[PDB]
Write a protein that binds this ligand. Structure first.
Ligand code: SF4
Ligand SMILES: [Mg+2]
Ligand SMILES: [Mg+2]
Lengths: 261, 1152, 261, 261
DNA sequence: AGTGAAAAATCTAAAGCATCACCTTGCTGAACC
DNA sequence: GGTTCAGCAAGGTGATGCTTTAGATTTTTCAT
């Protein structure tokens, strides 16, 4: 008997529509600390980490740790049934694999409830180690997602350089080179249009833009995305849905073939 | 019907007097005479009682030529199974319906091949109905067959009613033997086989003919065989016509003596006798006869055939250009070939004389010679088999050679004749007759008929030795119901797994790469002693204690295999192998005890009362099933059936009456029902074609009747017996050539050629079993059997691929065998010095032994048993593992093409080149079909003849780049330097036109547009005789319009210039144009795109997959391959996540 | 000699968009009673009735009963150039074999006449059975379009229940079973978003969601749609457009085999 | 180099968005008069000219008459990176062997460089026959484009005719005959719907409508289309507003002189 | 070096479906009387 | 303190490019 209330039901839509496009199967974990989603790609490259706590979930209780291996190509066809202002109530059973949803209209005119049977699978777990994770930058999610979608046509991979003179997004392609610079306009009282860039060293590291497309699908969750990088480490991306939780998403880079011999 | 009776009577004594003057005098004297059978034809010989009756005449030859013909009476056969317990009154009604039309009706019990509960001795019984003549049989066939079809639905409905309960003419339940011919059924029931020494007993006239086999005389007499070949006059650049052109020369070849008859009306001078000897085993004695006109030439030919009297006549493509031309030239000059040698056209367009087997080597080259397809001409077959080059001559220039000098033209004609005759008697004459000793069919039909009906004739022979009733032809059943409840559209077994895993140039001199996994090598080092032990104890069937020299070949094996461990990655020359049984599939029938009549489902298996667990009665085997069907349910089908009943509907018969539901045939209502469901599920169910692919297990019973199994068993071990006998007589010859015993060496040469031909024919039929099983509609064809055989072939061959991927670089997976390479440091072939006197040397294959242990250890089966002696009730227990993957030997070259999209697999496309440069085999290429363009033929020949140059991949692609650069530079310069007269032949494409312009209706295509242009050329007069296949090119200047409406013929360009100019301006929709020469209206973009697609799919894409730069840099890669290649070679690469992030656990949601 | 006026162009443009999918060939009936169209769909399961009364037109003067047999896809292809504001006029003559119609604008500048030929085929005129409707629901068309496109993704066979509490849609299928309830709206006096229930006895049956989508694609016609059901009759869809006329759908339910049920 | 200043750069991105099907590869010619494109399409039918005058732009800076043969559809996939409110700034270079385009966000915190190596093809220039045409018409491109995309799909060939009372467009097809008439606006001074016709002698021409709505659809660059037309000359289609837009099409009559019969 | 006919691969037109820019509308904030 | 008009977020909607299904055409394969 699990319950999970969410009054602002558009954010569950916005997280779930961002994981169909490059994850086929992810295994939700539930415990007293909240709900987690620690799951790798089926292509075995980049990995998801949802963490949502109980200070945004209104009606919420959970006394046992368990897991459910939900499918992602079929769960994001039954959640857009609610509109952008409906409230969403998840329910679950101890012994049954049936996950139930409740979509309730805010004006009390359309009540729907859903059941979905699930299946058990066998995936891997990749825990994160704690590191410096410097060169942290904060950008608007709309601008970053817009430019990430834009650079997909000119190139297939990106070189990201955190240096003193802003941030360098240089995609590498056969036709031309498209590079993006972010200026430190720190003299703004508004946090939306003012970017924060702090660092310990200039870091140059390269990533797969074809995965950055399916990556950047989580646009309208948080107004500001916070991305951070270091050397020889996967990029970390935080989409902080500050009412309860945050999406950390980790993308492994491309590196050289060490020193040739 | 007296007029037709006297007509066929006159035909009977006409053929009889035709053969009496031709040498085949009848068996009219009372006595006993030996003979050897030559021909088999139906005839209409009567009896002394003047009762109408059909008979059959055999032709018997002697060792000294005192030939004769024996006609014996024989009525045709027919079987009808009726309802049980009431078969007397149906036979009495059948006898009383026709005064004396039926000859005899009788009933004797038999056994059904698929009747359940056969252990208690169940019986099903037919009645035999015999007619006195064949045309009465076909008249009764046409009288009764639609009634049978309609009543079959009634019987089917009754069966459905009976199934629901379980949940006068109309007393007949089914009928068979309407497709077996007269002579064929004749042999099936009497067992009289062509090519066997017989003796005949015939006393008096009232007694019939007695015939008895004399099989101890294993020698065979040489029949007098005349091979002949014409040449005709012709007007240039056109296929010759038989109404105006006439023969300048005939050349023919009778039993080693050659003659040449020439027309002196066109030929300028007489021709003297000459000798032509290409090889010492091919003698060429030749005499010349010269006649003033064609009438005296054909008269000399006819009288010399009447005098020498050849039993077997040999041509090359005789049924196409030869016989219609000579028949028409007889008809022009007031004669006919029916009236002097008896050669007329049959119903199928083939020419079969009543006494002279017309026999055509081109059909054998197409079918059994195993030459590559697209290489079926006589020159190719003579070079492949006889091992010499026939003299070539241009038919365009042969007309001027007919008047300039006749000697070289005569040499060409007699070369054609001697090539045809020696390719006949050295190879295919004892081959055909060795096929004939086992197939009950006359020689012209056993050469003409297909592979499946040859297997059918063998199975009918063994079916009537076993006394079973023949299943009919498997018809197509309309609207088959899936057990799920959906009607079908297509229903298919395993889809012919073909995969070209690599593409590139491969040779025995090229250095290739090997990643060797040492785990399989560690397996092999501890296996190899037992592997060679088992190979010598099973492939040779001798004990290992017999040989003494095991240790030194074992040490050579150890040294080679240990020098293979020393590095995984290595580069040397690979030997090219073909890892398979020649037809694994018959052995897959054998070792699994498979047969098409002993595979059922679980329901009728549980209906049988002798089921028992833990026994051999229930065995199961795996395959995979494919069905494209209709997503509409089953109850809706009853709904739409009810809604399509009792309503008005348009009859198909013009001005017909008001038709109802009951008399509608199944095919018209089937189309209506398909249209109704296609309309119903274009709207409600979102689909109309659902492709379900699943896996199935079938239960194979024990042998109710083992007729399909023991045929293959006896035929395989008789093949091996004949192979051993041929090897024994080959060693006898190999001693006799230095014995010096001329008559004895000639007779043992005859014996070894005979045994070689029996071995070759048995090999061809053993290959033919698979080709018979893989078609639908055969009279013994099982769906599940074909699926099982193809899937187990796939599983065995991918097990072999899984192992051989680590000892080299295997290349091409096929439904016939792995085509792969192996390193040369890997040992290839071992000779054994054996102390046995029966074999001083033993040749054993090392990859063969490896594949033998593969198929032995991988597949152990306990179902094999031997029945030696029923009296002692003994049962030895041993397993049969006779899957002999015979490596055919190291080839010289191997070429693979590639495919035109990202990641699709090719469809049976490769070329294999044998060691002496001869093209060993070719499959799936453009040269297979004589159509398309012959702009591509010369390019493809010049590229496949040019892979045998250079040592490294750089050099071989350099030579291929030279060839492609030459041909694309001829294309790129618009073919300007050479004369343009041959260019109109070279560039244009020729498409046939089958129907008329109005048959397709409103549909318009390229051929329809070309026919419309041809109609606009002259008018409806050309449409009246529009049997000519249309040649065309593609226009260029109207851009935007599709190429389906952009075809212009070359017939406009041969017209007078002013109408050409005006009507070309009418075609091109541009009256302001000024030029008329053929330089710009050619769509060179389409032509260079065609040649570009060829050079992509043959050369450049395999080059990109062989890590080399493009040999044709002016032809760009496709986008997907360019992306993959530019991503691969960049050392900047993608790193995965299992290395950069460690593993923290493995779990599963386990059941509690 | 026939003549008709429309001071609005939305409805006559959108009926052809609403009806082109079910019907390929139709038979109009123009008379003093107005415009009649009874038709079978091409699978002969669903029935359609397009009815236009004479008093709904601005001026509607005709001669006598005329049955005319052009198809419908050509009409929707040619007439959809008109907008939602252009005014409509159609004229005809008995002796002429073609019917003309002008799309005119109130400023008398944008104007377009089209004349259409008459291809002649006469289908059978079957009598529509008229009986009582046991359950009547009057509910908005936008919510009905949302719920039909909602249930299209989950399942194929929708089971619909009419009870005292309201209406209940339910969908089976391999991706779960959905349940949607719509209750009475008694505290809402405005009727452009409320529902209305006329109730005799509880009913429920199974219907095909592809056909429901094919009925519901008529949604711009009216702000409300009247679904109604009785014992074993084809379910009727009433599109009360205006005083102009009606557009009525009839759908037979599917018979479920008792075996294995 | 023409790294000109633009107050708004939506025009270039939409003309590349629309003309991605007309020309498969073009060459940008820039001289002291501005930018002049003259390109002949893939089917070799019309010659399209675009004139963007230098004084229409904010600034001009080039060494001489420079023709850069950049593939037209290749840089169309990258030019929509800029927004409709994005601007193109100014830079000075004299020996640039690689052309770069500058992208500047409206908030002046994001700068981007999109480069393209110099590759060139020589295209033959064609003379343009120019004289005073008989009939020039002017209608807003909205309803003209709307009827051109709603009447090309009933017929392939149109007789276009110009007279004093109203210009007509008549296309026949297998589903009927349609035609469009335009009258004259004299009491209307507003630009949004005025159709002004300057008229000399009535003309008749015949054209294919497939090429007219699909390969020559660049409507929102201007708002009023003007068609220049005369006897025995091809079409002149003009999209024209002020100094910000002037493009034109030259579709030719593909009518033979009765050689079919 | 022929022929004819059927199963399957290939080519082409039309419908499904996710996405993007734009039209219209409800909620709300600051200047005004 | 009521008003009111503009600003802006947001749903509905026409238009669009890619994808998927369906029917006609050639191509291989088998019988001859
Ligand atoms: S397998 Fe079944 S049907 Fe066949 S003999 Fe055994 S019990 Fe009878
Ligand atoms: Mg010949
Ligand atoms: Mg010849």
């Amino acid at each position: 008997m699990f319950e999970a209330r969410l009054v602002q039901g558009s954010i569950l839509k916005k997280v779930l529509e961002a994981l169909k496009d490059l994850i086929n199967e992810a295994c939700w974990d539930i415990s007293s600390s909240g709900v987690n989603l620690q799951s790798m790609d089926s292509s075995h490259v980049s990995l998801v980490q949802l963490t949502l706590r109980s200070e945004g979930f209104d009606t919420y209780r959970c006394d046992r740790n368990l897991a459910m291996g939900v499918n992602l190509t079929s769960m994001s066809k039954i959640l857009k049934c609610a509109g952008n202002e409906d409230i969403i109530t998840l329910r679950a059973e101890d012994n049954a694999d049936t996950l139930a949803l409740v979509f309730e209209a805010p004006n009390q005119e359309k009540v729907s409830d859903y059941e979905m049977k699930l299946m058990d699978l066998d995936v891997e777990q990749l825990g994160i180690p704690e590191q410096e994770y410097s060169c942290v930058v904060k950008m608007p999610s709309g601008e970053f997602a817009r430019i990430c979608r834009d650079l997909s046509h000119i190139g297939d991979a990106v070189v990201i350089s955190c240096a003193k003179d802003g941030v360098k997004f240089s995609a590498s392609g056969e036709l031309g080179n498209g590079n993006i610079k972010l200026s430190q306009t720190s003299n703004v009282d508004k946090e939306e249009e003012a970017v924060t860039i702090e660092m310990n060293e200039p870091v140059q590291l390269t990533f797969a833009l074809r995965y950055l497309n399916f990556f950047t699908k989580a646009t309208p969750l948080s107004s500001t995305v916070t991305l951070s990088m270091s050397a020889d480490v996967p990029l970390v991306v935080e989409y902080k849905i500050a009412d309860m939780g945050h999406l950390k998403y980790y993308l492994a880079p491309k590196i050289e073939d060490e020193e040739g011999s | 019907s007296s007029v037709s009776a006297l007509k066929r009577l006159e035909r009977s004594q006409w053929t009889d007097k035709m053969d009496l003057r031709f040498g085949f005098e009848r068996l009219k004297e009372p006595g006993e005479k030996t003979g050897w059978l030559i021909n088999m034809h139906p005839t209409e010989i009567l009896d002394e009682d003047k009762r109408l009756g059909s008979a059959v005449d055999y032709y018997f030859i002697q060792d000294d030529g005192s030939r004769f013909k024996v006609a014996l009476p024989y009525k045709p056969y027919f079987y009808i199974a009726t309802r049980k317990g009431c078969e007397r009154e149906v036979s009495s009604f059948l006898s009383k319906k026709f005064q004396g039309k039926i000859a005899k009706v009788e009933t004797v019990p038999k056994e059904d091949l698929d009747l359940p509960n056969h252990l208690v001795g169940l019986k099903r019984n037919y009645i035999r109905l015999s007619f006195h003549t064949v045309e009465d049989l076909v008249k009764v066939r046409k009288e009764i067959s639609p009634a049978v079809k309609k009543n079959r639905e009634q019987d089917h409905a009754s069966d459905a009613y009976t199934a629901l309960l379980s949940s006068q003419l109309d007393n007949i339940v089914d009928m068979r033997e309407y497709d077996v011919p007269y002579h064929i059924r004749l042999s099936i029931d009497l067992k009289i086989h062509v090519a066997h020494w017989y003796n005949v007993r015939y006393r008096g006239n009232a007694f019939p003919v007695e015939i008895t086999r004399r099989d101890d005389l294993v020698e065979r007499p040489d029949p007098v065989v005349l091979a002949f070949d014409i040449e005709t006059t012709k007007l240039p650049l056109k296929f010759p016509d038989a109404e105006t052109d006439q023969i300048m020369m005939i050349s023919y070849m009778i039993d080693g003596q050659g003659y040449l008859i020439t027309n002196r009306e066109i030929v300028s001078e007489d021709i003297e006798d000459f000798e032509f000897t290409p090889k010492p085993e091919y003698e060429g004695p030749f005499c010349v006869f010269n006649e003033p006109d064609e009438a005296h030439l054909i008269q000399r030919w006819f009288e010399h055939v009447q005098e020498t009297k050849p039993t077997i006549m040999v041509t090359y493509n005789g049924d196409f250009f030869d016989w219609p031309f000579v028949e028409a030239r007889a008809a022009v000059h007031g004669l006919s070939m029916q009236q002097e040698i008896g050669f007329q056209k049959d119903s199928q367009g083939e020419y079969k004389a009543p006494q002279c087997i017309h026999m055509d080597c081109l059909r054998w080259v197409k079918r059994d010679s195993y030459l590559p397809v697209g290489s079926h001409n006589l020159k190719a077959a003579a070079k492949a088999k006889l091992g010499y080059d026939p003299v070539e001559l241009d038919p365009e220039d042969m007309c001027r050679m007919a008047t300039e000098q006749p000697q070289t033209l005569a040499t060409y004609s007699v070369s054609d004749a001697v090539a045809t005759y020696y390719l006949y008697m050295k190879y295919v004459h004892p081959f055909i007759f060795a096929l004939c000793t086992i197939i009950p069919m006359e020689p012209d039909e056993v050469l003409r008929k297909g592979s499946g009906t040859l297997c059918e004739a063998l199975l009918m022979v063994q079916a009537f030795h076993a006394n079973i009733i023949f299943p009919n032809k498997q018809e197509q059943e309309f609207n088959k119901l899936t057990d799920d409840g959906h009607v079908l559209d297509s229903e298919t077994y395993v889809g012919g797994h073909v995969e070209a895993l690599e593409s590139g140039v491969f040779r025995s001199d090229i250095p290739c790469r090997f990643r060797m996994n040492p785990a399989a090598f560690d397996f092999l080092l501890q296996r190899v002693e037992k592997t060679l032990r088992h190979a010598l104890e099973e492939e040779e069937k001798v004990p290992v204690e017999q040989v003494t020299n095991f240790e030194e070949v074992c040490d050579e094996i150890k040294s080679k295999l240990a020098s293979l461990k020393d590095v995984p990655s290595r580069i040397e020359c690979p030997l090219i192998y073909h890892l398979d049984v020649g037809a694994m599939y018959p052995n897959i029938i054998l070792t699994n005890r498979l047969q098409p009549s002993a595979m059922v489902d679980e329901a009728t298996c549980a209906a049988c009362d002798f089921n028992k667990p833990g026994a051999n009665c229930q065995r199961k085997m795996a395959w995979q099933w494919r069905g494209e069907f209709m997503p509409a349910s089953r109850s809706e089908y009853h709904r739409i059936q009810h809604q399509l009943e009792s309503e008005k509907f348009p009859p198909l018969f013009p001005e017909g009456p008001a038709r109802a539901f009951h008399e509608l045939s199944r095919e018209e209502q089937a189309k209506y029902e398909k249209r109704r469901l296609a309309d119903y599920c274009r709207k409600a169910y979102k689909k109309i074609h659902i492709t379900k692919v699943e896996e199935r297990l079938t239960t194979i019973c024990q042998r109710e009747n083992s007729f399909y199994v023991d045929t293959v068993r006896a035929f395989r071990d008789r093949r091996y017996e004949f192979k051993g006998l041929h090897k024994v007589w080959k060693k006898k010859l190999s001693a006799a050539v230095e014995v010096g015993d001329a008559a004895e060496v000639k007779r043992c040469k005859n014996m070894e050629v005979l045994y070689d031909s029996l071995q070759l024919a048995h090999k061809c039929i053993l290959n033919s079993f698979y080709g018979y099983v893989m078609r639908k509609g055969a009279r013994w064809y099982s769906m599940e059997m074909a699926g099982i055989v193809c899937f187990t072939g796939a599983n065995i061959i991918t097990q072999a691929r899984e192992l051989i991927e680590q000892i080299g670089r295997p290349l091409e997976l096929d439904t016939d065998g792995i085509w792969c390479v192996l390193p040369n440091s890997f040992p290839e072939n071992f000779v054994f010095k054996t102390t046995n006197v029966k074999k001083p040397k033993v040749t054993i294959s090392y990859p063969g032994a490896m594949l033998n242990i593969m198929v032995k250890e991988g597949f152990t089966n306990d179902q094999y048993q031997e029945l030696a002696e029923p009296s002692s009730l003994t049962y030895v227990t041993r397993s049969e593992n006779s899957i002999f993957f015979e490596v055919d030997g190291p080839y010289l070259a191997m070429i693979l093409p590639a495919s035109k999209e990202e990641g699709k697999k090719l469809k049976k496309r490769y070329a294999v080149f044998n060691e002496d440069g001869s093209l060993a085999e070719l499959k799936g290429f453009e040269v297979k079909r004589r159509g398309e363009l012959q702009l591509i033929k010369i390019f493809q020949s010049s590229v496949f003849e040019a892979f045998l140059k250079g040592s490294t991949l750089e050099e071989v692609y350099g030579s291929v780049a030279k060839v492609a650069d030459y041909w694309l530079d001829v294309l790129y310069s618009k073919a300007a330097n050479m004369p343009d007269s041959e260019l109109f032949e070279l560039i244009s494409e020729n498409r046939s036109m089958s129907r008329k312009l109005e048959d397709y209706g409103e549909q318009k295509s390229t051929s329809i547009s070309t026919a419309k242009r041809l109609a606009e050329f002259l008018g409806d007069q050309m449409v009246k005789d529009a049997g000519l296949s249309c040649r065309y090119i593609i226009s260029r200047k109207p851009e935007g319009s599709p190429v389906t409406e952009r075809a212009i013929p070359l017939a406009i360009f041969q017209a007078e210039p002013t109408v050409r100019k005006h009507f070309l301006r009418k075609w091109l929709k541009s009256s302001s144009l000024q030029d008329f020469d053929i330089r710009a209206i050619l769509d060179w973009d389409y032509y260079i795109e065609r040649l570009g697609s060829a050079i992509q799919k043959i050369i450049t894409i395999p080059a990109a997959l062989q890590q080399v730069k493009n040999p044709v840099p002016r032809v760009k890669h496709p986008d997907w391959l360019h992306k993959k290649l530019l991503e691969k070679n960049d050392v900047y690469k993608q790193k995965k996540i299992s290395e950069l992030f460690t593993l923290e656990g493995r779990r599963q949601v386990t059941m509690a």
